[PDB]
Short mmCIF file of N, CA and C in Angstrom, two decimals:
data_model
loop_
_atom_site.label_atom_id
_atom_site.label_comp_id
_atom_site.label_asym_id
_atom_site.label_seq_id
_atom_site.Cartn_x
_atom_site.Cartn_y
_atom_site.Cartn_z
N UNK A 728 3.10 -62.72 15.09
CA UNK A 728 3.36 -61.77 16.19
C UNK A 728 4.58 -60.83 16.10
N UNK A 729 5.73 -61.32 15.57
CA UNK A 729 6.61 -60.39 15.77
C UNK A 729 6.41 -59.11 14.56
N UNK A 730 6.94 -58.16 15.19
CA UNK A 730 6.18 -56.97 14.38
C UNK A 730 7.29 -57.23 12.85
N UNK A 731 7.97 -57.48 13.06
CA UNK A 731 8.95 -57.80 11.44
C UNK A 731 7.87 -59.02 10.42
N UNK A 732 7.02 -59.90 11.05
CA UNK A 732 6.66 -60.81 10.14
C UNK A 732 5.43 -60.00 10.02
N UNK A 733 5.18 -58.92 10.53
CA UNK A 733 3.67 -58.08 9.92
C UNK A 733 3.31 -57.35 9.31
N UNK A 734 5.25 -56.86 8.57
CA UNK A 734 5.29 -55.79 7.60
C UNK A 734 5.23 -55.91 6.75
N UNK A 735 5.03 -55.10 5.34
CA UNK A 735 4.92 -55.36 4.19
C UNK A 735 5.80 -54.48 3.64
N UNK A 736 6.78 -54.73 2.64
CA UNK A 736 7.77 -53.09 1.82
C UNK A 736 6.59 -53.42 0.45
N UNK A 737 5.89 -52.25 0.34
CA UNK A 737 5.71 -52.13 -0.60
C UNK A 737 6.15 -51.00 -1.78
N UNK A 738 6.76 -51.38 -2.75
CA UNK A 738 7.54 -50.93 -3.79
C UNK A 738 6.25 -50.53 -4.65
N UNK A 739 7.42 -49.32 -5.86
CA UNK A 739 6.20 -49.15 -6.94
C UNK A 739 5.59 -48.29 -6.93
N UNK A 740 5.01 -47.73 -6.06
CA UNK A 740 4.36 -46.75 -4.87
C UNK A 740 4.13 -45.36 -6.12
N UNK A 741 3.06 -45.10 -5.99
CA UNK A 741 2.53 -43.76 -7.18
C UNK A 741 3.20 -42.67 -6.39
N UNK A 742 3.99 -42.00 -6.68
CA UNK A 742 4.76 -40.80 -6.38
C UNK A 742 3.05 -39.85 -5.51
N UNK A 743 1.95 -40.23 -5.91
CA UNK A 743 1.11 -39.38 -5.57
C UNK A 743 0.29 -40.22 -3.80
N UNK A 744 0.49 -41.28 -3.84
CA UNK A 744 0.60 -42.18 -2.56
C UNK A 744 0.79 -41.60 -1.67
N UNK A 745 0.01 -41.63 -0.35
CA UNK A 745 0.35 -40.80 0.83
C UNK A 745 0.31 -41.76 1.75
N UNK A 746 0.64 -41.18 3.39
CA UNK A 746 0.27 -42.34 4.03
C UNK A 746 -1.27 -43.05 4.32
N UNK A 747 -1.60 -41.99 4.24
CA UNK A 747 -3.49 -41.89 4.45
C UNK A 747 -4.03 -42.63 3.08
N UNK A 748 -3.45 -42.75 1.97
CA UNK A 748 -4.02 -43.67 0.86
C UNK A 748 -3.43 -44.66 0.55
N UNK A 749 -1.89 -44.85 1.36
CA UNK A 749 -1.76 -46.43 1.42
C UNK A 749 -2.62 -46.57 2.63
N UNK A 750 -2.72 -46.38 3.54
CA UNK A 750 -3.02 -47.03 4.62
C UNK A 750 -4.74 -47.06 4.43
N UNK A 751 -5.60 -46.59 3.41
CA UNK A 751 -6.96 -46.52 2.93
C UNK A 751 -6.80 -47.75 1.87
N UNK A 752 -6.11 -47.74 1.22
CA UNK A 752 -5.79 -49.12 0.91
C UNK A 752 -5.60 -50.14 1.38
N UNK A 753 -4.53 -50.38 2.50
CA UNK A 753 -4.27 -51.42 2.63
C UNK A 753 -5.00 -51.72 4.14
N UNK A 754 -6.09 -50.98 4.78
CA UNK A 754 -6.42 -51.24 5.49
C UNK A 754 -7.66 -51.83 4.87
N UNK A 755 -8.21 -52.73 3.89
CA UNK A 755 -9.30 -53.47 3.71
C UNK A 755 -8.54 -54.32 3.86
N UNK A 756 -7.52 -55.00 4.19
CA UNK A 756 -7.33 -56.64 4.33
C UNK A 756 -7.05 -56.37 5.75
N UNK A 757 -6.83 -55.70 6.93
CA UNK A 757 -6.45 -55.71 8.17
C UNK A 757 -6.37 -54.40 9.08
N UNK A 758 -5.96 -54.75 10.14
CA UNK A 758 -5.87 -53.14 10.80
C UNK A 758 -4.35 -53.30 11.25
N UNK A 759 -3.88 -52.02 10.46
CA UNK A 759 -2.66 -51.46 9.75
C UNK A 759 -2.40 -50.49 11.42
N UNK A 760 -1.05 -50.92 11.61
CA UNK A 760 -0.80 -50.49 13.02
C UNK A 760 0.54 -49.52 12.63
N UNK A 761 0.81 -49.99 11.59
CA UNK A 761 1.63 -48.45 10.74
C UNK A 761 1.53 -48.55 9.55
N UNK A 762 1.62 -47.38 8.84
CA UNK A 762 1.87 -46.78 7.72
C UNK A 762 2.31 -46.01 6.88
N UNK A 763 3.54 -45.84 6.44
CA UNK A 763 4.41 -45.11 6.03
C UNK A 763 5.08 -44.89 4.57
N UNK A 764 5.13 -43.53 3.87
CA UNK A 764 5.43 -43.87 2.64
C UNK A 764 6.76 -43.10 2.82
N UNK A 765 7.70 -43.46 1.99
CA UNK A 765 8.95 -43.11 2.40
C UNK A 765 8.84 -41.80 0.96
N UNK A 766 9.76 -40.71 1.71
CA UNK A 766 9.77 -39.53 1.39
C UNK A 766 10.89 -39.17 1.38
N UNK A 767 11.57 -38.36 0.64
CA UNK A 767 13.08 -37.43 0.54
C UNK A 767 12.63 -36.47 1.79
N UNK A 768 13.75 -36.58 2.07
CA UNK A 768 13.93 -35.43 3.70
C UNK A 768 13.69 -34.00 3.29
N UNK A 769 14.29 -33.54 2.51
CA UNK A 769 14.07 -32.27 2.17
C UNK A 769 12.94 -31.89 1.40
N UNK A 770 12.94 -32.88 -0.07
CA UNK A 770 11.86 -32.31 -0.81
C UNK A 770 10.70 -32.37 -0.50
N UNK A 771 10.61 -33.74 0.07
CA UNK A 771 9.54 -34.42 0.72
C UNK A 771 8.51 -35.12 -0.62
N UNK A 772 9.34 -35.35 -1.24
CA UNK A 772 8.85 -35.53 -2.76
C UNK A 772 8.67 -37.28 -2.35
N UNK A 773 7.90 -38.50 -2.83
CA UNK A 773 7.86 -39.40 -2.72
C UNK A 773 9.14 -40.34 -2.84
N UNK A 774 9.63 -41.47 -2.48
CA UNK A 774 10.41 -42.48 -2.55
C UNK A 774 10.09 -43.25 -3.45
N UNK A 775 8.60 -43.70 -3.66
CA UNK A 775 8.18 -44.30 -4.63
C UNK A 775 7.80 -45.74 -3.95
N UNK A 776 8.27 -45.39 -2.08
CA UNK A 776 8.01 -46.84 -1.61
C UNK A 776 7.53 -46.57 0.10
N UNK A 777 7.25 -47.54 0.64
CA UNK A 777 6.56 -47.23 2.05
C UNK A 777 6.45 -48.82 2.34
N UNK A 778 6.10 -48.98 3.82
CA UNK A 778 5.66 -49.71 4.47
C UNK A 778 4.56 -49.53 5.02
N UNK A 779 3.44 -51.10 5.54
CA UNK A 779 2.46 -51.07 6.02
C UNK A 779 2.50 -52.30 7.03
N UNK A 780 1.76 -51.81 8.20
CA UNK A 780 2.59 -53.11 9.04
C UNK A 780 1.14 -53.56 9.61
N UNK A 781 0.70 -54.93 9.43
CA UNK A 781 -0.73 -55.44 9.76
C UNK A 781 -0.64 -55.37 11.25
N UNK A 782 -2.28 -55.79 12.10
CA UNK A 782 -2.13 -56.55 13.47
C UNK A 782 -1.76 -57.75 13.06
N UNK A 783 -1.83 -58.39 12.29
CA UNK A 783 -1.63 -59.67 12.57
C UNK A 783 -0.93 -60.36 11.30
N UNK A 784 0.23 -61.90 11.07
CA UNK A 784 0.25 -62.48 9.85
C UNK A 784 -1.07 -62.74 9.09
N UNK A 785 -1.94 -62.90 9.19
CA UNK A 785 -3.02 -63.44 8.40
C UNK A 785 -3.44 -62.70 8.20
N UNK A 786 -3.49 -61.16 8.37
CA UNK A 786 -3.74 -60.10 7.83
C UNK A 786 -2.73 -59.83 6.59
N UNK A 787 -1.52 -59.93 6.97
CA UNK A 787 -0.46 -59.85 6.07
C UNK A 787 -0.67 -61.04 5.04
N UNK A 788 -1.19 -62.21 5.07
CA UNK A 788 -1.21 -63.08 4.04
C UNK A 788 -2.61 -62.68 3.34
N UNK A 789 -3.90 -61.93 3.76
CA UNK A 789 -4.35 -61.41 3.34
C UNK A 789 -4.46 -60.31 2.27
N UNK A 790 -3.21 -59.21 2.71
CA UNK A 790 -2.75 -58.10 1.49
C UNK A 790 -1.99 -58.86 0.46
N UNK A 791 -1.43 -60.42 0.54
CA UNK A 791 -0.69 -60.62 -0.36
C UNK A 791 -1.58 -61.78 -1.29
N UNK A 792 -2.35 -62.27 -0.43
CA UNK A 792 -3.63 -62.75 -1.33
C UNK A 792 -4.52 -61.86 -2.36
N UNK A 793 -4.47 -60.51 -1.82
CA UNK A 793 -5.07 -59.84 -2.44
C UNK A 793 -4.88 -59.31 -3.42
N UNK A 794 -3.21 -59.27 -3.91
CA UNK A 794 -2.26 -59.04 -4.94
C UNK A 794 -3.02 -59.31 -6.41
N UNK A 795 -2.80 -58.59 -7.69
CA UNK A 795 -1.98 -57.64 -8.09
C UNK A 795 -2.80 -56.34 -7.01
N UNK A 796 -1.92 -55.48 -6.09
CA UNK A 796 -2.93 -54.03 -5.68
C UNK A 796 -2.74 -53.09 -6.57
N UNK A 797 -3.55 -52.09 -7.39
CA UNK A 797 -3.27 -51.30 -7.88
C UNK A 797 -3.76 -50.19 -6.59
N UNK A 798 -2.98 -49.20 -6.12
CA UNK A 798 -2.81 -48.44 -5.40
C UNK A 798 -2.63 -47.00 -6.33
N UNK A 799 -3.74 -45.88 -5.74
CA UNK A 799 -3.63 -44.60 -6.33
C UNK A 799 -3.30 -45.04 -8.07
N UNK A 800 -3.98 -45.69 -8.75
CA UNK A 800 -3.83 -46.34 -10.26
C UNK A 800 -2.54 -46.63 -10.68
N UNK A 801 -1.58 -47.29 -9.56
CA UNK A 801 -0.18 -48.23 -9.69
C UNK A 801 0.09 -49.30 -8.87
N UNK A 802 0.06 -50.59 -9.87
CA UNK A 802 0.52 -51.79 -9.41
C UNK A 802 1.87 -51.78 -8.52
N UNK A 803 1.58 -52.12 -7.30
CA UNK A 803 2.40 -51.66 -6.42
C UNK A 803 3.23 -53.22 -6.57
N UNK A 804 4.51 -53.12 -5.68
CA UNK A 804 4.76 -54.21 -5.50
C UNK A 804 5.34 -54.40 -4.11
N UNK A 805 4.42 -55.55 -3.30
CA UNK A 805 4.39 -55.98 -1.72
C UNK A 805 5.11 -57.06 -1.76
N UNK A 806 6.15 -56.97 -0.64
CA UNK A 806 7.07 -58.29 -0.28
C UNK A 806 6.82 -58.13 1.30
N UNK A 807 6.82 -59.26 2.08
CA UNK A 807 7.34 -58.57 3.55
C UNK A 807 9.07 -58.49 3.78
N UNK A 808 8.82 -57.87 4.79
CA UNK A 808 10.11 -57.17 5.13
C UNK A 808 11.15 -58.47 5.69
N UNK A 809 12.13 -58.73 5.54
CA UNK A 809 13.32 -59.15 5.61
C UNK A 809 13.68 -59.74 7.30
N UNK A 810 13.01 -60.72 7.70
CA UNK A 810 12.97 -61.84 8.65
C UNK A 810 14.70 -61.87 8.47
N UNK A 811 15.10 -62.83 7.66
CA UNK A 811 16.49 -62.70 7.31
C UNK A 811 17.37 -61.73 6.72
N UNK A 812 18.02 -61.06 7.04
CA UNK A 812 18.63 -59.79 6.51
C UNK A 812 19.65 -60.98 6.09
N UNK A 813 17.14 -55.21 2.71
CA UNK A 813 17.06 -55.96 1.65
C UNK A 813 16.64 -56.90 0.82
N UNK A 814 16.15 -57.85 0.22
CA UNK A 814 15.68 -58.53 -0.09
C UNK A 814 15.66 -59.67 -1.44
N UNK A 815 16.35 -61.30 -1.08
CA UNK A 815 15.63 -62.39 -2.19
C UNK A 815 15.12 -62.61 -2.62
N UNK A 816 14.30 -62.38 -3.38
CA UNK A 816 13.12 -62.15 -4.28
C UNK A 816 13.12 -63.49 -5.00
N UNK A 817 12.91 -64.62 -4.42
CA UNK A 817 13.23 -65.93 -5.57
C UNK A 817 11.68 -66.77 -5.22
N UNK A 818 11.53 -67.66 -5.93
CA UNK A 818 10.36 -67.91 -6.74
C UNK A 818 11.07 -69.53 -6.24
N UNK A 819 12.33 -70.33 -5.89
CA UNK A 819 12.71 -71.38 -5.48
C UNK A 819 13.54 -71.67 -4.64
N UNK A 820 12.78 -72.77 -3.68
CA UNK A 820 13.52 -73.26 -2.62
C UNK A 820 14.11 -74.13 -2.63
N UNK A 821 15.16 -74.91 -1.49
CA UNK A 821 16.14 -75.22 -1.28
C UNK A 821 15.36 -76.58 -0.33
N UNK A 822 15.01 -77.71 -0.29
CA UNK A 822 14.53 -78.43 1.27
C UNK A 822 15.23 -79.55 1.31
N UNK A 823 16.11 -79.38 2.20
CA UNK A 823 17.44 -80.41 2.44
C UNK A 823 16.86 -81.51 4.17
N UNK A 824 17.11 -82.45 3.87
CA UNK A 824 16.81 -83.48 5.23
C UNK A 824 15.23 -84.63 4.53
N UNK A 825 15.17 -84.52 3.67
CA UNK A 825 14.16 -85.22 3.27
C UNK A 825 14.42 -86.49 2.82
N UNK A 826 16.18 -87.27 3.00
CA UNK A 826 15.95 -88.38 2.69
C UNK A 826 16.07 -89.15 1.88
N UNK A 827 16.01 -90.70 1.91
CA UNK A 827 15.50 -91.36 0.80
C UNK A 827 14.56 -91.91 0.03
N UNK A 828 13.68 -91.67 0.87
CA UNK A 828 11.88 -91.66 0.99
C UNK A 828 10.71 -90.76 0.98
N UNK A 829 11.22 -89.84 0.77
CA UNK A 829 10.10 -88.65 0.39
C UNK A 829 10.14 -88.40 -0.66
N UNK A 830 9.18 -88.75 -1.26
CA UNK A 830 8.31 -88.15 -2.61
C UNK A 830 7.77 -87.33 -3.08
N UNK A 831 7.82 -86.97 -3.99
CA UNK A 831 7.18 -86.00 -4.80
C UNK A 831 5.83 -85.29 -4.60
N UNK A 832 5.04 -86.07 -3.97
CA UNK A 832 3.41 -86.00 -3.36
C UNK A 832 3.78 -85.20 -1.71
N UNK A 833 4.54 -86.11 -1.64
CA UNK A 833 5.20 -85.87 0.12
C UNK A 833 4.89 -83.98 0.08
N UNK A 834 5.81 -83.69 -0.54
CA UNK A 834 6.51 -82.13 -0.81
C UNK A 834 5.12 -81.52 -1.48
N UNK A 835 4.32 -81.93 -2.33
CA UNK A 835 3.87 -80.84 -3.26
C UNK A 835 2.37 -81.26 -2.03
N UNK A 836 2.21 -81.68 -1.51
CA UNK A 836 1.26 -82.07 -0.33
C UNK A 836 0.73 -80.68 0.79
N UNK A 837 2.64 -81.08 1.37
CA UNK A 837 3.15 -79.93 2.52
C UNK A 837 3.26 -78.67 1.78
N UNK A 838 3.95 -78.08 0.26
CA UNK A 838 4.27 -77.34 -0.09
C UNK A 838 3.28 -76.10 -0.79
N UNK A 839 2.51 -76.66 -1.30
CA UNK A 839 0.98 -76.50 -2.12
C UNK A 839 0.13 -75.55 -1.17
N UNK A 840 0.40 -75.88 0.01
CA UNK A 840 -0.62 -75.14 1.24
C UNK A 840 0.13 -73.48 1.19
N UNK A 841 1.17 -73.27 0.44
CA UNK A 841 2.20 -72.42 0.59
C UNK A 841 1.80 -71.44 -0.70
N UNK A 842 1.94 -71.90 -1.47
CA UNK A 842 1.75 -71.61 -3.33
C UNK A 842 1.00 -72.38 -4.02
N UNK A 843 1.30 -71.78 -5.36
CA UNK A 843 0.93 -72.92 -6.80
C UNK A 843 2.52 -73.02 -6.97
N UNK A 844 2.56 -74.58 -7.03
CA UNK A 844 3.99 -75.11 -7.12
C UNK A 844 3.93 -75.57 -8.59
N UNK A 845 5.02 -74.87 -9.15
CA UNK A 845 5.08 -75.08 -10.57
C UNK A 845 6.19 -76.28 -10.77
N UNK A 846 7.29 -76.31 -10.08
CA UNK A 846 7.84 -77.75 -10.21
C UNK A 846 8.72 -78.09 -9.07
N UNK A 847 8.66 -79.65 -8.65
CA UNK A 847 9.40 -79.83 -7.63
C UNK A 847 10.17 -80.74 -8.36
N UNK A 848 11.55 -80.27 -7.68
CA UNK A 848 12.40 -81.74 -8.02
C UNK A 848 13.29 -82.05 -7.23
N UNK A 849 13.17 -83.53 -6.97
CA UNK A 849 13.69 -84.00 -6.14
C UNK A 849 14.90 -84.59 -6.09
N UNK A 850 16.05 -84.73 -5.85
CA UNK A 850 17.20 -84.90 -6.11
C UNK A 850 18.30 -86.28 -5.60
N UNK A 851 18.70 -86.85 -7.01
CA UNK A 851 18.89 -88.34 -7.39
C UNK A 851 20.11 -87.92 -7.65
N UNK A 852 21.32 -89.23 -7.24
CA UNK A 852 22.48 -89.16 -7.79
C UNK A 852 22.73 -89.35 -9.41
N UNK A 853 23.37 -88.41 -9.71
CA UNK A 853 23.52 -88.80 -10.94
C UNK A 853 23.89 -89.77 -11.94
N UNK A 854 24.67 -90.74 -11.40
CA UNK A 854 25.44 -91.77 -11.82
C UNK A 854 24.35 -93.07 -11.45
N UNK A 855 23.78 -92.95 -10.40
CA UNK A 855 23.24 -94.23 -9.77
C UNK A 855 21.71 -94.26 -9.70
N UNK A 856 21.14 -92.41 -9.95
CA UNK A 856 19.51 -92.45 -9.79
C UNK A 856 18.89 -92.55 -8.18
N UNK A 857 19.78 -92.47 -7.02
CA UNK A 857 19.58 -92.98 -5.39
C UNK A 857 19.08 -91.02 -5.47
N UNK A 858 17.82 -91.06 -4.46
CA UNK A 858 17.86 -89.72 -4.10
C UNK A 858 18.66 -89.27 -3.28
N UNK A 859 19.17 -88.07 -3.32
CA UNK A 859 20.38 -87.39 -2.67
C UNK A 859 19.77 -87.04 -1.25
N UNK A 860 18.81 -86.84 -0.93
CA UNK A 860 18.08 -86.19 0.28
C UNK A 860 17.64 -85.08 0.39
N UNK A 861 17.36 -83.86 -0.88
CA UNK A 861 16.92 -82.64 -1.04
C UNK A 861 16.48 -82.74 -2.32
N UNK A 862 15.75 -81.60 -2.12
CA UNK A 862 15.18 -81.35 -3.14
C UNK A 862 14.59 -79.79 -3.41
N UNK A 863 13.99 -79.45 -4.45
CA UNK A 863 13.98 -77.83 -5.09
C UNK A 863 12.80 -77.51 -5.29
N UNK A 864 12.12 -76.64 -4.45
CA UNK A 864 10.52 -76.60 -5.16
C UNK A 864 10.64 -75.14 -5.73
N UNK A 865 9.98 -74.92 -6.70
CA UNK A 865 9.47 -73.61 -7.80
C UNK A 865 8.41 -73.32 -7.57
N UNK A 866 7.41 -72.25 -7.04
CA UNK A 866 6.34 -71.90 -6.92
C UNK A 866 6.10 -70.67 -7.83
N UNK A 867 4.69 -70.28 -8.52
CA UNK A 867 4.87 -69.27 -9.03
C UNK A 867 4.98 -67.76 -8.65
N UNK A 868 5.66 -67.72 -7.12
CA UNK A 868 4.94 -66.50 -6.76
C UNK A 868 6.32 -66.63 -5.66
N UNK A 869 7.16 -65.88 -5.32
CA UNK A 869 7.77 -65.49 -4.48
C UNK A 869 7.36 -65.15 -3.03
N UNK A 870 6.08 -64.64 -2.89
CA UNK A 870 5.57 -64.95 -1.20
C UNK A 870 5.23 -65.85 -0.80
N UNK A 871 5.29 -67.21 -1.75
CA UNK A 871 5.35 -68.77 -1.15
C UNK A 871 6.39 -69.14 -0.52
N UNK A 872 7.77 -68.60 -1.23
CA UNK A 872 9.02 -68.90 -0.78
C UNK A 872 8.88 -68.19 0.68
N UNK A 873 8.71 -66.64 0.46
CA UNK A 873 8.72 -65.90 2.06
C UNK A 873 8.13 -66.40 3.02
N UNK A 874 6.76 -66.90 2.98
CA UNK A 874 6.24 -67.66 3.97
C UNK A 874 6.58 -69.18 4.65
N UNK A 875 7.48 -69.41 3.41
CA UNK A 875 8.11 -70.55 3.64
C UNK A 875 9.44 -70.25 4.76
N UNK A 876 10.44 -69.50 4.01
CA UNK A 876 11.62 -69.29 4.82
C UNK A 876 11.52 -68.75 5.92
N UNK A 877 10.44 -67.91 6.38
CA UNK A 877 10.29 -67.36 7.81
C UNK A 877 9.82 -68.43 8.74
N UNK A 878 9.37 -69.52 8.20
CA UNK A 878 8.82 -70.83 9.30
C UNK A 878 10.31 -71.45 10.08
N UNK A 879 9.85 -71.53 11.23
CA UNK A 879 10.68 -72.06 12.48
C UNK A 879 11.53 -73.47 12.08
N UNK A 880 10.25 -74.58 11.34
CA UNK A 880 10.56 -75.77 11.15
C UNK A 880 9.52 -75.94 9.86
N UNK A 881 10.12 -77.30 9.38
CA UNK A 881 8.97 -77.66 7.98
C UNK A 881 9.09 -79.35 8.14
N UNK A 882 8.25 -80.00 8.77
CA UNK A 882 8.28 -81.14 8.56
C UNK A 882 7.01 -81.96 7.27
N UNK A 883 8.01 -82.95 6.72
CA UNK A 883 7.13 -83.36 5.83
C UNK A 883 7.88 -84.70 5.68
N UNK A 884 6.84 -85.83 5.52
CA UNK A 884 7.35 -87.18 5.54
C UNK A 884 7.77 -87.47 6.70
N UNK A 885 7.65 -86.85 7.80
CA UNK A 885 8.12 -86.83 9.10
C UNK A 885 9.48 -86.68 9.37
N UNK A 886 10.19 -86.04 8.30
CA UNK A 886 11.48 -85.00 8.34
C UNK A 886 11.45 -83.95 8.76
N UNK A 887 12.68 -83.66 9.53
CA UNK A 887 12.57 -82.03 9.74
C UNK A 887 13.40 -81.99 8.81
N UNK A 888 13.22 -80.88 8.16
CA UNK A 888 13.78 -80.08 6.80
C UNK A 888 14.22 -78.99 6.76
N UNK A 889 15.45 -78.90 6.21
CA UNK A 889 15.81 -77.46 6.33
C UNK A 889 15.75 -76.86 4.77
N UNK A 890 14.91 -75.77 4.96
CA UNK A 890 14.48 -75.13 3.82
C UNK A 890 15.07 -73.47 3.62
N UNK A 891 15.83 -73.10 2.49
CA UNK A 891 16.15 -72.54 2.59
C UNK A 891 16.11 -71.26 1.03
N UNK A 892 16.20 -70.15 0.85
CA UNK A 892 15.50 -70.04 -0.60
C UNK A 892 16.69 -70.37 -1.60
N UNK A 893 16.70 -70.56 -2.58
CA UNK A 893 17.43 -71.22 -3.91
C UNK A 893 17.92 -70.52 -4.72
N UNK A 894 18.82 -70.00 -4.81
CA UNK A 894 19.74 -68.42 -5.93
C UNK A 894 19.16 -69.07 -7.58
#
């Protein structure tokens, strides 16, 4: 619902991209309630980037399901827009509160519904092998992380978890 989790920045953008052919684009996954390609003020020459803002998230997880887009014959590149203020672009998270008892299954269970999780690891003292209570998941795709970090809460193992993305 909130109009920030419905946007998309999409980068990349064919200098020849208008709003009428992103928004002919990106209106097969949803109905696009804006559409905008960003333009120099004066020249009016392309930015090379624009936004598209769905009715709905599942429209928006839709355009990003739908990924690689080649738009006007250029692989564009779609992130949504910045819930947390620019943009992290990371591929791994951070999920702290999980404990001494959550496992590996636990996480790639809850996490999996998110991405393809390429590795989780879960985090053991070093000296002693005791899990520390967090742990790091890697997904291959950076809008696993986004969909992740914009969630309210993440419980798993019946932890609330604080998840956060991973530098």
């Amino acid at each position: 619902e909130p109009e920030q989790l419905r946007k998309l920045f999409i980068g990349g953008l064919s200098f020849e991209t208008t709003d009428e052919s992103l928004r002919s684009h990106f209106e097969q996954w949803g109905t696009l309630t804006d559409c905008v390609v960003m333009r120099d003020p004066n020249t009016k020459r392309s930015r090379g980037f624009g936004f598209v803002t769905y009715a709905t998230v599942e429209e928006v997880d839709a355009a990003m399901n739908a990924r690689p887009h080649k738009v006007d014959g250029r692989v564009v590149e779609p992130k949504r827009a910045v819930s947390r203020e620019a943009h992290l672009t990371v591929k791994k998270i951070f999920v702290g509160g999980i404990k001494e008892d959550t496992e590996e299954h636990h996480l790639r269970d809850y996490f999996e519904q998110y991405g393809k999780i390429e590795v989780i690891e879960i985090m053991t003292d070093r000296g002693s092998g005791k899990k520390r209570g967090f742990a790091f998941v890697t997904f291959d795709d950076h809008d696993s992380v986004d969909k992740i970090v914009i969630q309210k809460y993440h419980t798993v193992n019946g932890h609330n978890c604080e998840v956060r993305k991973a530098l």
